[PDB]
Amino acid sequence: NHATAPMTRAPAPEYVPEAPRHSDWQRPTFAFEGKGAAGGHTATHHASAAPARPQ
Amino acid sequence: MLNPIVRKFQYGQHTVTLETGMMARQATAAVMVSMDDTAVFVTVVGQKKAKPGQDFFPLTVNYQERTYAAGRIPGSFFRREGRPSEGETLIARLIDRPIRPLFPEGFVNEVQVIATVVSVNPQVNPDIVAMIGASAALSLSGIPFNGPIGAARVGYINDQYVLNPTQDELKESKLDLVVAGTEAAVLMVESEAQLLSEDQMLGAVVFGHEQQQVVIQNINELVKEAGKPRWDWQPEPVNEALNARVAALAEARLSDAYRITDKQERYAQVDVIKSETIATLLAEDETLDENELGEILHAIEKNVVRSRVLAGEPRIDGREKDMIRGLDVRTGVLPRTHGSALFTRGETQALVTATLGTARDAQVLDELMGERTDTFLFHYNFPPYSVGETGMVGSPKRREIGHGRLAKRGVLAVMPDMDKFPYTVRVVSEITESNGSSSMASVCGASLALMDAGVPIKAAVAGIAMGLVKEGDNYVVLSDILGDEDHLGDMDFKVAGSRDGISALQMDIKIEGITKEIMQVALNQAKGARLHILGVMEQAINAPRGDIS
Amino acid sequence: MLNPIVRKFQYGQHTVTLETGMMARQATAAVMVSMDDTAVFVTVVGQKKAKPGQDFFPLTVNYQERTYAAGRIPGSFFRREGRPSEGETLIARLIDRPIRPLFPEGFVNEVQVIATVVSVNPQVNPDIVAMIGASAALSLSGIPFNGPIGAARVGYINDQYVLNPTQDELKESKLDLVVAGTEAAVLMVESEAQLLSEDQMLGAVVFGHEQQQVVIQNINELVKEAGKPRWDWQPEPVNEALNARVAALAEARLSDAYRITDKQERYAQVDVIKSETIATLLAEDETLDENELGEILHAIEKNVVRSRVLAGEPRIDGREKDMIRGLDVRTGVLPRTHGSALFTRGETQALVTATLGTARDAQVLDELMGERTDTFLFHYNFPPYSVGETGMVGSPKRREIGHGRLAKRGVLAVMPDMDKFPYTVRVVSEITESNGSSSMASVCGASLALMDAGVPIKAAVAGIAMGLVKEGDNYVVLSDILGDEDHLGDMDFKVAGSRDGISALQMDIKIEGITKEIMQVALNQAKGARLHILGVMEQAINAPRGDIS
Amino acid sequence: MLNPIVRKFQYGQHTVTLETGMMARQATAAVMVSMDDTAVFVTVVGQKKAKPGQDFFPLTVNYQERTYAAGRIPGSFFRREGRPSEGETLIARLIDRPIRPLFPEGFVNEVQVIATVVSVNPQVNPDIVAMIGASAALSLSGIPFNGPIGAARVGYINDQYVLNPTQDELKESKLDLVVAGTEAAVLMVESEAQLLSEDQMLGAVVFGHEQQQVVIQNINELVKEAGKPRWDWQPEPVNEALNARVAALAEARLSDAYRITDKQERYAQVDVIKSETIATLLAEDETLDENELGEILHAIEKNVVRSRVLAGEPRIDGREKDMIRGLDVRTGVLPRTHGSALFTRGETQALVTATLGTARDAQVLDELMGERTDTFLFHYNFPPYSVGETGMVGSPKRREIGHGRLAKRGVLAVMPDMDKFPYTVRVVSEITESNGSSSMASVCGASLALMDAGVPIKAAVAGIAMGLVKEGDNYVVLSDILGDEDHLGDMDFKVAGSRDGISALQMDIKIEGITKEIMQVALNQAKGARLHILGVMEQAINAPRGDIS
C-alpha cells in the first residue's frame, strides 16, 4: 500500500514513426435549412425614420 | 419606565398610528407606523460629521420584509429571510426617490433609513406605510430635511378615484398610481394604467396630492410634540472669488464654443478651453485644487447649456425641443428565438427577445401579502459596453431593476388575458447602446418582439422620456431627452402607452412651481412623441406573426 | 440610418457570417458571429488611458449563455440566469488563454471582452463561435493586437480527423481537441482523448491549424473593409541607463550565486545582493523607485536562470532537463472514506478521495445545448496554505476551476461504462502542497483513489507538466517544471494518460518557431516521464480492490 | 522521502492519534488528528512580517466539513459544499475563542488556522478533534503562543459526569458542556443544560478541565519531539516617556472627571481634558502621533475606571456591583404576529416574535453525522441602528450567529416536547438597542413571546451577563455589564436559566487565578440577578395563553 521513488532520470523512449493510416469513411454532410445569420441584415420587417417633429 | 408618544388619525378608510419614543432609542429617530394592522418600523441614523473630501450625498434606504409579519415560517432552505428580493429593492427605491431631492444642497453626511415590515394585513400594502414612516422618521430626527412628504396610492374604479384601495379593490381597478409630494408640490409619481387618457392620469396625481395633506399635517403635529432639536448644520461656504476667476476666464469662451454645430470639434474645443483655464489658474497659485476647478468648469458649462435651451437655441445635438431622434426598427434578427427585435432611437439601442413557455415555467413568488403566480416575466440587462465603459457584468444595480419594472409596467397593459393565450411569456431586453432612456426603447422593443413571436397583444406600445426645464415663469419641454441632458431636467417624466392611452407613467419633480396646466402641456407633447414613434413602429410589423409555442 | 458590414464564408461544413457596424456602436468594437444557427454577440471595450502606475495587464473575458437562445425559460427559482456557471467560466478561460499573449509588451490599458450567446443550434457548439467573435472584435477595434486568431475543434472518427464535429458526431469520436492559433504559430491546445498516441494528437493540432487559416483570412478581409483606425499607443520608454547600471552592479554576483548547490544559502546571498544594490543606488540617487529596482533585479535574475538553462547547466534545484522529482504514493490514508490517496512529487502534494454514490446522486445540468446527466464528478480545492500564505478560503477562482476540468479530462478516458459500473463517482482533490503542477498530481491521486475505492478503471493514468525554452534554434525541454520556472516556459504543456496513450493534452505556446519535430520531441520526453511515474504508481497498487457501496 | 511523526494516546474511551510532518509541508504547521476514525487535518500559517500600521491582531479561523468524510455525495444542486454553514461558523468561533487571549500582547502578525474534517465517525464529534488539532498545530508552528490548550465535552448521565459523550449517549444526558483550557486555567466554557444547579454546572467545568490535561501533556511531548524553532519575536518597545508625560498631564484630571454623576457633562469634561492635553503635547513636539496620544488616553481612562471599580466606587452609570438596570416588559406589541414581546433592560432592547407552523416547516439539515429535523428555529437580527451606526443590513457576522446560538441554548431547555406540542416554532429576535447583553435580552424576550403565542413552555427563562474584575487577590463581580465595560471583564460569563436551574452557560476567562470559590461567588450573584429579572418578568405574564395554531 506504499511505494516511494528517489530523484531519478526518465530518459525519453526510442521513437518509432507511425505507419500512415488509411480510411474509407466519408463524413455525412450536415443538413441545415435555415436563415443561418443572426444580425439585423436578416430582419423580416424593417422600418426607419429620419430625425423629425410630430405631424 | 419608557413612555411612548402616540398620534392617531384617519386616512381615508384606514386609521394610521404613529408611535415614537419607545423603540430604538439609540438612533437619530425611530417610528412605528401602523395602518390598520399593517405595522412597519422605520429607523433613521444620521452621522454628525461628514467625511473629509466627500463630494456626493451618501443616502442609503433599505426596505426589509419579515415573514413572521404574515404569520408564516419562511420557505427557503435555511428557513430564514435573506438578500433583498426584487420587490423589496423596488420599494426601497420607491421610498428613496422622493426623500433624496429634499436634503439641502451641500449636505453630504451619511444617512441610512431602514424600514422593516413587522406586521402585515393582507389587504393593506406596506409600501405606503413604509413611505409615511420614512417621512415621519426623517422629520423627527433633526437632520436638515425640507418638509415632511406624504404618500398615497390611487386607483380608478367605476370611473371614480379611490384612495389606498385594498387588494380586492385593486383587482377591479384600471389604475395603480403612487404619488408622493410635500405640502407645496408633488415630487414623485409611479403608476401603471390600463390605457387611460392624460386627463384621467393627471386627475389621479392631483387627487392623491390633495389627499396626502392629512398625513403631512399629522406628521407636522407629531414633530411639534416629540421632535428632536434641529441640527446646526451650515452648508460649506462657496468660493465666490474662484467662481468669478473661472467665469471671467472661460464662460464667454464656452458660450461661443457651444455655437459649434459639430460634436467632435465642439467637445475638442471645450476640452482645450478647460485645459487652458486650469493651466492658467493652477500656475497662478499652486494651492488651488484641480478637481474643484473642474467642478466649477462643469457648472459653468451646465449653466450655458441651460441658458441656451431656455433661450430657444438648438440643443447640444442640434435638435429643437419637440424633435425626436432617428428611428430604426428591425424584427426577426435572431434565428432560433421565438421572437426578436432590434429597436434603435438615435444612439439608444435595445435588442429584445420574447420566449414562450407552458404553465410550468410561470414564476411562483411567496410574498407577505400572498402567494402569486407571474406568467409574464420581464428581464432587463444593462451591460457596461452600452455606455462604452468597462465594468462588472451580471450584477444588476437598483437602477436597472427600477428600469426593468418600469418597462414591464409599460408593456403589461396590452398583454393578452390567460383564456385567449394560455402560455407563459418571458421578455428579455438587452440594452446595446444607451444615450437616453433605455427603458422606453425597452418598451418599444418588447412590443415588437411580442408581435414577432406571435403573442396576440391588444395593441402596440411605445415609450417616450421627456424633460421640463423651468426658470421663473419660463419653461421648455424637451422631447427625447439624452443622457447628457439630465442636469436640464427640472421635471423628468417617462410616459409609455399605445395609440389610445397611457399604460405607465413615471414622474420625478424636483422643483416647486409645476402646476397642472404645465403637466398637461408636457403630457400632450409626450403624447405627440409617442404617436410618432408608434407610427414608425407600425410600418414594420402591424399584427402578431403566428408562430409555434 | 444604420448600415451593417457583412462577411460570409464557408468553414468546413458550415457558413460563418460576421456582421459589424450596426449594434453596440458605443463599444470599441462589436461583432455578431453566426455559424449555422449558433449566434454569439461579442463586444470589446478598451480604455484609452492606462491607470496611473499600473504594473500588470488587466484583461477580463466574460462569457454569457442566455437561455432564450435555446427557446427556453430558465428553470432557476427566479427564472433568470444568475452567476456564471462552471461551463461558462471554462469557455471564458478558453477565450482568454490565446488572446492574452498577443497584446504588446508594456500594454496595460484595461480591456473587457463580453461574449453573449444569443442563439443556439443544438448541434453547433457556441464556444468556437465565441472565440472567432472575440478574434474579430479584437481585430476590428484597433486596440494593439498582434494578429487575428482562428479556432478549430477537431474530432477523430473512423481513423480520420473531423473538423468541427457536431454533437452527434462527438459521441462516436475518440477525440475532442480545441486548437487556437495565429497565421504563423499555434497558441493554445485543449484536448481530451480516449488513449490516443502522440502522432495522432500532433496530427490533430496540425489539422486544426491548417483549417483555421480560412477564418483568419476572412477576418483580415473584414478588418480591411470595416476596421477602425489603429491606436497610436507606444510602449513606455525603458530606462536603458538604469538597467545598465543595475546590470553592471549585480549581474556577475547573481550569476555566481546561482552556481551554489544549496537553496537556502543561495536565497540568502541573493537577498543580500538585492539589498546592497538597492542601498547603493538609493545612495547614488534618492528619487529612484524601490519597486522599479526590485523588478529590474527580478528581470536580471530571470535572464540568468534562462541563460544557465539554455547553456546546459543544471536547473535551480540541481535537476537535469529530463529528471523527475522524488515520488511518494500512499493509498488508504483516510479511515472512513471509500477511496483515498496521497500523491507527492517533490514539493507538490495532493490528497485525493473517491466517493461512490447511487444513480440519484448524479448531477443534472441544464446546459444551453441540452440536459446532461453527469455520473462522474471531479472537484479540485486549492487552499492558500498549499503555497504557505494566508488568503480567502473556499472560493474557487477561474484557474482552480480550469485545473479541475483539466484533471477530469485526464481521468475521464479510463472511467468504466455505466453497464460495468452503474454507480456515481465523486473525486475530490485537495492540494496540500503546490510547487509545480498540482493539476497533474490530481490526476495521479485520482487514479490511486479510484483504484482504492474499487472502481474498475480500465488502466491507471498519470500526468506530467513540462516546459520548453527556446532561443534561436537552441531549445531545451524541461520535465516536471517547478512553480519558480514559469518564466522559462516558452511552451507550457501538460500531458496526462495511461501507459498506452494520451488521455488529455494542454498546450500554451507563447513564442513562434515551434515546428512539428519540436512538438514530437517534447511529447516523447513527456511519454518517458509518464511511464516512469506510472511504474512508481504501479508498485503501490496495481488493480482495483473489491468494494461496492 | 516523507518521515511522519505519530503520537498516540488514550483519551477516555477513545484513542487520539496526532500525525505531523508528512502533509502540507509549506504551511507553518500542519497536523492530522484522529479520534476513533474521526479525522481533522488542521493547518496554521503565520506571516513573519507584520504590515506597518497594524493595530489589531488579524486572526482567522476557518472550519470546513467535507461530505466525502461521511461517504456521501453532497446534496446541493452543484454537488459542492458552498459557503460555511451555521454549524461550521459556530465551530470556527468555538475554536477561535480560547486561542485569541493566548497570543502575546502586541502580536499583530496575521495568522490563519484552517481545520478541514476529512473523516467522520458518526458517533465521535469532529469539534473536539478540531480544537485539539488547532492547539497542536499552533504549538508545533513556533508562533508566539502562550501554551497548548486542551478541550473536552462533558455530559451528565445518571447523575455522573461523562467525558466526550457519544451521539447516542448525548440523548439521555442532561448536559452538553465544552470546556477548553490550558494546564493552569480554564479559558472557554460553552454549555447547554436541562435546568441544572450551579454546583452541577461548575463540577462539570472542573471535571472537564481535569480530564483534558492528558491532551496538553501529549501535545507538549509531540512539540518536544517534532516542533519548529520558536519565532524570534519581540513586542514593540513602549515609549515610557510619552506615557509618563501624558499621565502627569491628564491622569488626575481624568480620575477627577469621573467623580461627577451626569453622563453628558462627564463626557464633555473628558473630551475637554483630552483636547487640551493632546493639543499641548502636539504643540510642544510635532513628531508625536495623534493616534498614539488617543490610544494612550483611552488606556489611562480604562485604568481609571478599573481602579475605581476595584476600589469600591460606583460604576460609570452610578450603579453598584449587584445592581441590575431598569426593566420594562411588554407583550402583544405587534398586531398580526402569533406572539410578540418587547423587553428592555436599561439601554438594551429586544423585540422578539414567535411564529407557529406545521411539521412541514421544520428545517431539515443534512449534517455529517446524520440528517436532522429541527422544529425549534431561533433567528437573531442585530441591525446597525441598535448602536447608533450606519452599515450593511442583512449580513450576519460571526458574533450575531454565536449570540443567536447562545440564546437558543438558553431557551431550548423549557421548550415543550413534540408529543405535547406537535408544531414548529420560529422565534425571531430583533435587537432594537444594544448597550449590554443583547443575547440575554433575546432569551428574556423569547420566553415572553413564547408565552404570548401560547406555547406550553415548562417555565419562564431569563439570562444575565456578568463580569469579574481581578487584581492580585482582590476581585469584584459586576452584574449586568454594559457595552462600555468590556475592558472591565477579566471573566465574562453569560448565565441563562429558569427559577430552578441553569439552561445555558458561557464563560470567557482572560486571566489566571480564577479558583472554584470565585466561580461559586460569581454564579450565586448571577443567580440572584436572574431571579430578580424573572420575578419582574412574572408580573407581565405568568402562564401561556390558550392560543394554539
Author numbering:
A (entry chain D): 1004 to 1058
B (entry chain A), C (entry chain B), D (entry chain C): 1 to 549
Q: How do the authors describe this structure?
A:
In Escherichia coli and numerous other bacteria, two of the principal enzymes mediating messenger RNA decay and RNA processing—RNase E, an endoribonuclease, and polynucleotide phosphorylase (PNPase), an exoribonuclease—assemble into a multi-enzyme complex known as the RNA degradosome. At the core of the assembly is the endoribonuclease RNase E, which initiates turnover of most messenger RNA (mRNA) transcripts and processes precursors of ribosomal RNAs, transfer RNAs, and small regulatory RNAs (sRNAs). Notwithstanding, PNPase predominantly acts as phosphorolytic 3′ → 5′ exoribonuclease that catalyses the processive degradation of single-stranded RNA, involved both in mRNA decay and sRNA-mediated gene regulation. Beyond the residues that form the catalytic core (1–529), each protomer of RNase E presents an intrinsically disordered C-terminal domain (CTD), extending from residues 530–1061, that serves as a scaffold for the RNA degradosome.
Purified RNase E 921–1061-muGFP peptide was combined in molar excess with the PNPase core, and the complex structurally characterized by cryo-EM. Several rounds of focused 3D-classification and focused 3D-refinement resulted in a cryo-EM map at overall 2.6 Å resolution, allowing an atomic model to be built for the PNPase core:RNase E complex using the automated model building tool ModelAngelo. The cryo-EM map is well-defined for the RNase E peptide from residue 1003 to residue 1057, therefore, only these residues were built in the atomic model. The model confirms the presence of the β-strand between residues 1048–1053 (β1 strand), and a second β-strand was identified and built, formed by the strongly conserved residues 1005 – 1008 (β2 strand), and similar to the residues forming β1 strand. 3D classification and 3D refinement confirmed that only one RNase E peptide engages with a PNPase trimer, interacting with two protomers, leaving the third ribonuclease protomer exposed and unoccupied. First, the β-strands resemble one another both in length, sequence and interaction pattern: His1005 on β2 strand and His1049 on β1 strand interact with the Asp328 present on the β-sheet of one PNPase protomer (Bix). In particular, Arg1056 form polar interactions with PNPase residues, namely Glu322 and Asp320. Each Arg in the two proline motifs, namely Arg1056 from the β1 motif (1053–1061) and Arg1012 from the β2 motif (1009–1017) form three salt bridges with different residues on PNPase, suggesting that Arg1012 and Arg1056 are key residues for the interaction with PNPase. On the other hand, the atomic model presented here reveals that the upstream region, from residues 1005 to 1039, forms several interactions with the two PNPase protomers engaged by RNase E peptide, which are not limited to the residues forming the β-strand or the proline motif.
